[PDB]
């Protein structure tokens, strides 16, 4: 439900709901990145 992003510039977590314009609330930066999932991928060191 929260869907935290990362402010592309100030690297600050900030939590945004749907239908809300993307805008950082520390520095106004417009680009943001999803966070790494929590599921479990296995790798073969091969």
């Amino acid at each position: 439900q929260p869907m935290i992003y990362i402010c592309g510039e100030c690297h600050t977590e900030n939590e945004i709901k749907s239908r809300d314009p993307i805008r950082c609330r520390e520095c106004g930066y417009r680009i943001m990145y999803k966070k790494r999932t929590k599921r479990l991928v296995v790798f073969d060191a091969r």
């Binding site: 990362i6 690297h11 600050t12 990145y33 966070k35």
Partner: protein
């Protein structure tokens, strides 16, 4: 981007000889001399050290995504 663990051909470990090779280099040893210090005999292993291009150092300039 970073020093391979094993020589591709023979499989001898050269992962643990990069920083040492550089330290030898700045001690004013030649490439040949430094390479004979570290015990790389075959020209395959020496090919591995002598032809490395350490790019990871560049990538440690750009600041991370998640601070």
């Amino acid at each position: 981007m970073i020093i391979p663990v094993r020589c591709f051909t023979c499989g001898k470990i050269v992962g643990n000889k990069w920083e040492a090779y550089l330290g030898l280099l700045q001690a004013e040893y030649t490439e040949g001399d430094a390479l004979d210090a570290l015990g790389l005999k075959r020209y395959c292993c020496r090919r591995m050290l002598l032809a490395h291009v350490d790019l990871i150092e560049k990538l440690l300039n750009y600041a991370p995504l998640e601070k």
